[PDB]
Design a protein around this motif. Structure first.
Motif, PDB file in Angstrom:
ATOM      1  N   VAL B  29       0.866  -1.172   0.000  1.00  0.00           N
ATOM      2  CA  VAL B  29       0.000   0.000   0.000  1.00  0.00           C
ATOM      3  C   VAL B  29       0.905   1.225   0.000  1.00  0.00           C
ATOM      4  CG1 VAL B  29      -1.764  -1.191   1.296  1.00  0.00           C
ATOM      5  CG2 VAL B  29      -0.039   0.145   2.495  1.00  0.00           C
ATOM      6  N   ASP B  30       2.148   1.009  -0.419  1.00  0.00           N
ATOM      7  CA  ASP B  30       3.137   2.072  -0.464  1.00  0.00           C
ATOM      8  C   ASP B  30       3.126   2.765   0.901  1.00  0.00           C
ATOM      9  OD1 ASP B  30       3.547   1.366  -3.161  1.00  0.00           O
ATOM     10  OD2 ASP B  30       2.167   2.874  -3.938  1.00  0.00           O
ATOM     11  N   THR B  31       2.656   4.004   0.955  1.00  0.00           N
ATOM     12  CA  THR B  31       2.609   4.728   2.218  1.00  0.00           C
ATOM     13  C   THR B  31       1.209   5.256   2.458  1.00  0.00           C
ATOM     14  OG1 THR B  31       3.282   6.825   1.169  1.00  0.00           O
ATOM     15  CG2 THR B  31       5.018   5.416   2.070  1.00  0.00           C
ATOM     16  N   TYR B  32       0.240   4.681   1.759  1.00  0.00           N
ATOM     17  CA  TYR B  32      -1.140   5.112   1.914  1.00  0.00           C
ATOM     18  C   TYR B  32      -1.790   4.608   3.212  1.00  0.00           C
ATOM     19  CZ  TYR B  32      -1.722   7.494  -2.574  1.00  0.00           C
ATOM     20  OH  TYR B  32      -1.679   8.404  -3.612  1.00  0.00           O
ATOM     21  N   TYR B  49      -0.681  10.416   8.592  1.00  0.00           N
ATOM     22  CA  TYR B  49      -1.196  10.075   7.267  1.00  0.00           C
ATOM     23  C   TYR B  49       0.005  10.059   6.342  1.00  0.00           C
ATOM     24  CZ  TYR B  49      -0.493  14.831   5.631  1.00  0.00           C
ATOM     25  OH  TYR B  49       0.140  16.002   5.277  1.00  0.00           O
ATOM     26  N   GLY B  50      -0.101   9.327   5.241  1.00  0.00           N
ATOM     27  CA  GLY B  50       1.023   9.232   4.329  1.00  0.00           C
ATOM     28  C   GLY B  50       2.075   8.360   4.991  1.00  0.00           C
ATOM     29  N   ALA B  51       1.629   7.645   6.021  1.00  0.00           N
ATOM     30  CA  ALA B  51       2.467   6.740   6.791  1.00  0.00           C
ATOM     31  C   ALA B  51       3.375   7.446   7.794  1.00  0.00           C
ATOM     32  CB  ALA B  51       3.307   5.866   5.847  1.00  0.00           C
ATOM     33  N   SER B  52       3.577   8.751   7.622  1.00  0.00           N
ATOM     34  CA  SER B  52       4.473   9.477   8.521  1.00  0.00           C
ATOM     35  C   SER B  52       4.175  10.953   8.720  1.00  0.00           C
ATOM     36  CB  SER B  52       5.901   9.373   8.009  1.00  0.00           C
ATOM     37  OG  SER B  52       6.045  10.195   6.863  1.00  0.00           O
ATOM     38  N   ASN B  53       3.327  11.521   7.879  1.00  0.00           N
ATOM     39  CA  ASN B  53       3.031  12.937   7.996  1.00  0.00           C
ATOM     40  C   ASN B  53       2.103  13.234   9.159  1.00  0.00           C
ATOM     41  OD1 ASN B  53       4.465  13.434   5.402  1.00  0.00           O
ATOM     42  ND2 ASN B  53       2.714  12.301   4.571  1.00  0.00           N
ATOM     43  N   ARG B  54       2.630  13.926  10.163  1.00  0.00           N
ATOM     44  CA  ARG B  54       1.855  14.273  11.350  1.00  0.00           C
ATOM     45  C   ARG B  54       0.790  15.324  11.025  1.00  0.00           C
ATOM     46  NH1 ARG B  54       5.136  13.670  14.258  1.00  0.00           N
ATOM     47  NH2 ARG B  54       6.613  15.417  14.189  1.00  0.00           N
ATOM     48  N   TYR B  55      -0.471  14.898  11.033  1.00  0.00           N
ATOM     49  CA  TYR B  55      -1.592  15.785  10.724  1.00  0.00           C
ATOM     50  C   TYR B  55      -1.530  17.108  11.493  1.00  0.00           C
ATOM     51  CZ  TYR B  55      -6.443  17.432  10.305  1.00  0.00           C
ATOM     52  OH  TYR B  55      -7.567  18.215  10.130  1.00  0.00           O
ATOM     53  N   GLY B  68       5.184   0.090   2.424  1.00  0.00           N
ATOM     54  CA  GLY B  68       4.957  -1.202   1.811  1.00  0.00           C
ATOM     55  C   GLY B  68       3.841  -1.990   2.475  1.00  0.00           C
ATOM     56  N   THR B  69       4.163  -2.635   3.592  1.00  0.00           N
ATOM     57  CA  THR B  69       3.179  -3.430   4.315  1.00  0.00           C
ATOM     58  C   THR B  69       3.458  -3.448   5.810  1.00  0.00           C
ATOM     59  OG1 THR B  69       4.422  -5.498   4.037  1.00  0.00           O
ATOM     60  CG2 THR B  69       2.811  -4.933   2.339  1.00  0.00           C
ATOM     61  N   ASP B  70       4.568  -2.839   6.218  1.00  0.00           N
ATOM     62  CA  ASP B  70       4.924  -2.775   7.633  1.00  0.00           C
ATOM     63  C   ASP B  70       4.921  -1.332   8.122  1.00  0.00           C
ATOM     64  OD1 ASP B  70       5.220  -5.488   7.583  1.00  0.00           O
ATOM     65  OD2 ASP B  70       7.416  -5.454   7.435  1.00  0.00           O
ATOM     66  N   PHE B  71       4.076  -1.057   9.107  1.00  0.00           N
ATOM     67  CA  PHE B  71       3.959   0.291   9.641  1.00  0.00           C
ATOM     68  C   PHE B  71       3.963   0.250  11.162  1.00  0.00           C
ATOM     69  CE2 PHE B  71       1.777  -0.138   5.569  1.00  0.00           C
ATOM     70  CZ  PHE B  71       2.383   0.864   4.813  1.00  0.00           C
ATOM     71  N   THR B  72       4.354   1.353  11.798  1.00  0.00           N
ATOM     72  CA  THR B  72       4.395   1.418  13.256  1.00  0.00           C
ATOM     73  C   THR B  72       4.168   2.830  13.807  1.00  0.00           C
ATOM     74  OG1 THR B  72       6.809   1.755  13.353  1.00  0.00           O
ATOM     75  CG2 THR B  72       6.032  -0.522  13.353  1.00  0.00           C
ATOM     76  N   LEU B  73       3.208   2.955  14.723  1.00  0.00           N
ATOM     77  CA  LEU B  73       2.900   4.238  15.354  1.00  0.00           C
ATOM     78  C   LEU B  73       3.793   4.385  16.579  1.00  0.00           C
ATOM     79  CD1 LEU B  73       0.962   6.672  15.143  1.00  0.00           C
ATOM     80  CD2 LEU B  73      -0.459   5.553  16.816  1.00  0.00           C
ATOM     81  N   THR B  74       4.214   5.610  16.871  1.00  0.00           N
ATOM     82  CA  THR B  74       5.103   5.819  18.003  1.00  0.00           C
ATOM     83  C   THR B  74       4.769   7.007  18.881  1.00  0.00           C
ATOM     84  OG1 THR B  74       6.879   5.094  16.488  1.00  0.00           O
ATOM     85  CG2 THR B  74       7.519   5.819  18.705  1.00  0.00           C
TER      86      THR B  74
END
Lengths: 219, 214
Positions: B29-32, B49-55, B68-74
């Motif tokens: 899902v790329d960074t969507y 959003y955008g996988a890393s852009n802080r709203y 890609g397919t691996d994401f993590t919130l911190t």
């Protein structure tokens, strides 16, 4: 200030359709999509569909294909979502989010669609009296059982708010009967049982009900 | 149909900690991807959003990564308010899906429940209905197994229960289970038991009463 305001909560009988709305203010209505997510009680977010206010283009989650119908009025800046053949499974909270395209930037507060055929019924209050005469225990658990009511909600206070510490008014459960029911308890000193009066103040505005039920040790 | 799987389901941390939540897609899902936070009876608030852009507006302790397919919130410094549930979702393709969510609850030492059983009132019995109630008071953690037993006969399907929200003083949880039977049904037995199993108990605790016997 961007703003999405949804319609008032709905209560519908099985089989009926409903038309929830969402009004936007704070930007260009016809430049962003208007999404709709369903979140049943204690459940997660399920996407329903999306619509381009610009021309009415709409793309629905095939699962809601036969259930959801998103329409939109570009003159009154509002989007609509009409649900058909409402059933239990349809009881949830419907949100309208706006996307500065792929992202859900601004959400509506949501609308609570409650599907039930039950009619407004005031509750029957019952005591949850303390049972035990010992030296090992110091606290005595007592309370009230507000039962078989509809619709939500029921407010419950003890000794008219004079009691708050130790009180515990659980979340109402929706019984198979379709009617609601909840219980309220407060842990208190065994000693106080014979010197202090305990009463739960249950009110169910819908049925214009108000009842004070003195809960005492069942000796 | 892309599936979003979060981890863990329930994160129990303490103020100040540096919590990290995961969310795995089943397809690229790329960074969507986008993370949202949610509190009881409130609408989801977009965080990343955008996988890393802080709203715009989100606190800086919040950061998101992945692709890609691996994401993590911190969250680097869990604040007293960052206690809630967090959702991740992808808007890459159709249909848009969200993760099951991760509840970030407050940590504290284990504490068994305080159990109480309540026989049905006479008043309610007159109406030919009996409600037996079992109270599991201020226990931690939230996992608790409750089992009703009439004349030591396991019950099934005639009991409901609701749990309070983690308390705001001792961070404990209170549960309330109800065994609903009919007047006659109820009077057709003596011993009513409420067996509670919880991590804080060396062995399942039972609390019972007998029809009649004071």
């Amino acid at each position: 200030q961007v703003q999405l305001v949804q319609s008032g909560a709905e209560l519908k009988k099985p089989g009926s359709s409903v038309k929830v709305s969402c009004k936007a203010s704070g930007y260009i209505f016809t430049s962003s999509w208007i999404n709709w997510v369903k979140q049943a009680p204690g459940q997660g977010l399920e996407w329903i569909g999306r619509i381009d206010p610009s021309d009415g283009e709409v793309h629905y989650n095939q699962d809601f294909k036969d259930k959801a119908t998103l329409t939109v009025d570009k003159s009154t800046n509002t989007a609509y979502m009409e649900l058909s053949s409402l059933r239990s499974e349809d009881t949830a909270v419907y949100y309208c989010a706006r996307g500065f395209l792929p992202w859900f930037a601004d959400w509506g507060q949501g609308t609570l669609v409650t599907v039930s055929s039950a009619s407004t019924k005031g509750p029957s209050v019952f005591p949850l009296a303390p049972s035990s005469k010992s030296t090992s225990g110091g606290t005595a658990a007592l309370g009230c059982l507000v039962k078989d009511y509809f619709p939500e909600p029921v407010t419950v206070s003890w000794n008219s708010g004079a009691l708050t510490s130790g009180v515990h008014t659980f979340p109402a459960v929706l019984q198979s009967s379709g009617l609601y029911s909840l219980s309220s308890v407060v842990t208190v000193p065994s000693s106080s049982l014979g010197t202090q009066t305990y009463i739960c103040n249950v009110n169910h505005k819908p049925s214009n009900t108000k009842v004070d039920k003195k809960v005492e040790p069942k000796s | 149909d892309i599936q979003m799987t979060q981890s863990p389901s329930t994160l129990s941390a303490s103020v100040g900690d540096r919590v990290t939540i995961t969310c795995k897609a089943s397809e690229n899902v790329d960074t969507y991807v986008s993370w949202y936070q949610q509190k009881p009876g409130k609408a989801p608030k977009l965080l990343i959003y955008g996988a890393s852009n802080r709203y715009t507006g989100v606190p800086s302790r919040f950061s998101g990564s992945g692709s890609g397919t691996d994401f993590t919130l911190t969250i680097s410094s869990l604040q007293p308010d960052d206690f809630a549930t967090y959702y991740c979702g992808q808007s890459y393709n159709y249909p848009f899906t969200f993760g099951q969510g991760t509840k970030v609850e407050v940590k504290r030492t284990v504490a068994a429940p305080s159990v109480f059983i309540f026989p049905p009132s006479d008043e309610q019995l007159k109406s030919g209905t009996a409600s037996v109630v079992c109270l599991l008071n201020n226990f931690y953690p939230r996992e608790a197994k409750v089992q009703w037993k009439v004349d030591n006969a396991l019950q099934s399907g005639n009991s409901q229960e609701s749990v309070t929200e983690q308390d705001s003083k001792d961070s404990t949880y209170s549960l309330s289970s109800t065994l609903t039977l009919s007047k006659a049904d109820y009077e057709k037995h003596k011993v009513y038991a409420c067996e509670v199993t919880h991590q804080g108990l060396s062995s399942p605790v039972t609390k019972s009463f007998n029809r009649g016997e004071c």
